[model samples]
Target: MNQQKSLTLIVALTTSYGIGRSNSLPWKLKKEISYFKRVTSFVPTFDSFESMNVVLMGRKTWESIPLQFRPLKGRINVVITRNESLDLGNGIHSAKSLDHALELLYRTYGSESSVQINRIFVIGGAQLYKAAMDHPKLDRIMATIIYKDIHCDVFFPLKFRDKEWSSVWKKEKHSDLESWVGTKVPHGKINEDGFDYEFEMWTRDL
Candidate 1:
């Protein structure tokens, strides 16, 4: 198995791991957005070279971003889709598949001395998230657990419940709430803008 290093899954989910509805986030939690930016931007110091992170998503996920935030700033944006004729403007690059998109990223940054990749994050819609769930290189899942159960149309795959993956970091202590029974290392909890949420990190046990 070719394990991919430095790859992370970043997401925000409802109590059911439901991630989206009608191609948009189901809730209005804004703090998680800042946390997302912070985690994706964090890079360890490596002597003289500057580091850059990469965000990979399906084309629909790419389109979901408001026009003003299209190419998320300060990170390499790679959009994977089977649509051969699609061009998402100057800052974005399109790939026929996830494997190809990753290849493109490695070829472009793997050897560069001035700027190198810090981490690769999978940010997604349904299909793209499903693909990441099966990727060999997927390292960890960084998720914000939204306690509300807003109706949703799109969901993140539920493979995390399998024995192969384990919760290693969470935003706070384990809650007796049935929705959060098995989580470990809960980082903390927060109530902001009438939304209650927690952050968590899960890693594959392979």
Candidate 2:
């Protein structure tokens, strides 16, 4: 029984799988940041999610966000954490377990809800994506693949290597700022990960 209900993605700079050598991205990609804005515009989802989507993130993802944008600008922001004592405010909802998280999500934005929502997004810093991806509920995944490799501490799980998953689309976004790029001594000689890079989505096999 294969079905798609949730859309997940790793949004980051070029080749930045996990942006934090020691709690920070080793390099900068202003263009990539702008790309994030364009991708997240009102028209999301392969079929268009409009703006009724929700974002489920980990504590690290929540912290990665600037203080001014803590609650996130629009839609619902769900944070997964064991810190049951923290204040989640209004837009920020907290969940102890994956199931409980989905329950809260359904109650808040499901088809029966007064708001009447259709889809949700699982954005991550790392751990949150891990939790959500491992859960039995998630249906689809979107990963922003960059062309080069820098360095990082955190890593995406090897689930992509899982034989059950398959890739169905590919594209590339060109850039001209080839100068001041990958010159930092931290990660010397950038290695392109190949296939250029774009938002790649995968679905669990039937």
Candidate 3:
């Protein structure tokens, strides 16, 4: 990876590493959804003029997003898919792979452009998450750990939170997570819509 920018992977997953079911989220929590927006859409005031976050996702994940939130407003959305002929037609960027998306983003949002990229986030579906985990540039994971074993057909690619990977991935403390997220995040278990969850920032020795 010749890229200078690091990619942060943001996701909400269950105790079983489950993320999605049938191309859609198995659960719905409004605050959980809003928390996602707060992190992805946050921009440092100084760079806010031209900088915007970029969210890279898979085709199926893109389709699963609600119509009103499709482009994920505020952040630049790039959907990764091998099917190049498909005209997304909606002005969103499409890349063949994660590497391609990075190159494409750098080219499109170069210094000369008004829309500069501040941070790149890999928001996912199962396949894209697997690729992101292997990417050298991906160092941090902004994960929302849902406590329950929610039924899901699609699971997160890695069980980074488990004891097996505990030494490899370090979970940041509450204060640090809030500092990085640029917002005052709820510290412990947040019970929303009858589900208990918490925000956590995990980092690997990339």
Candidate 4:
């Protein structure tokens, strides 16, 4: 087995863990967007050496992003799709399955001493999130909890119910809703524009 690269799922959800509405996010929290950028853009700092992270998303998620921002600069973009013939041009690669994408990424950067991979994030659509959740290599979930009740047409699947997964933080009362803040770096809570939300990371037991 080629060294399996562990995967992480990054998402922002409502009090109910609801992810999307009409193929888009339910709320507009500028601070939350900034938080997302900070988390995903983070490359582990190991002395003089640093690495660029990667984002693996489903095809629909790829299409959801505006055309101008499709490549999401700085990080490698790996889009998974059923269509093997699809070409996303430079800076983007397609994979028929999540495993294949990881393999491809590993081959690309795994042995290159000049480039290191700090993390692989599953930046979603409901289907891809579900798949990453069940994948053995999925190591953590970085979630932003939106502190209000809102209607959503799509939800992040509750695949963390499995025994292998655990909340990195103990449950705590945060005014209205119960929440946990994990030990993952770049984790915090933001209250802005009439909405209260927390950024947390959940880990999987080895």
How close is every model to the real structure, measured as TM-score? 0.82, 0.67, 0.95, 0.81
lDDT of 3 by residue, 41-60 (tens): 99999989889999998888
Name model 2 segments beyond 4 Å from true.
1-4, 13-19, 38-51, 110-112, 159-197
How well is each residue in 1-206 modelled by candidate 4, as lDDT tens digits?
Answer: 54456787889888776788886567779877776766677754452164888899988888888888778787878899886564746868888888888888778776565777777889977999888877888867777888898889888787353344335323323321212221133335667877888865566564
For lDDT, candidate 3 versus 4, the one ahead is 3
Cα lDDT of all candidates, in order? Answer: 0.72, 0.55, 0.87, 0.73
TM-score pick, better of 1 and 2: 1
RMSD to truth, every model: 5.7, 8.4, 1.4, 4.9
How many clashes in each candidate?
A: 10, 1, 0, 0
lDDT of 4 at 206: 48
Error of 4 at 143 (Å): 0.5
Model 1 Cα shift for residue 41 (angstroms): 0.8
In model 4, where is the ten-residue run with the lowest total lDDT? 174-183
Residue 49 lDDT, candidate 4, scale 0-100:
67
The residue ranges of model 3 lying beyond 4 angstroms of the native Cα positions read none
Ranking by lDDT: 3, 4, 1, 2
Answer with 1 or 2, whichever has the higher lDDT.
1
TM-score of 1: 0.82
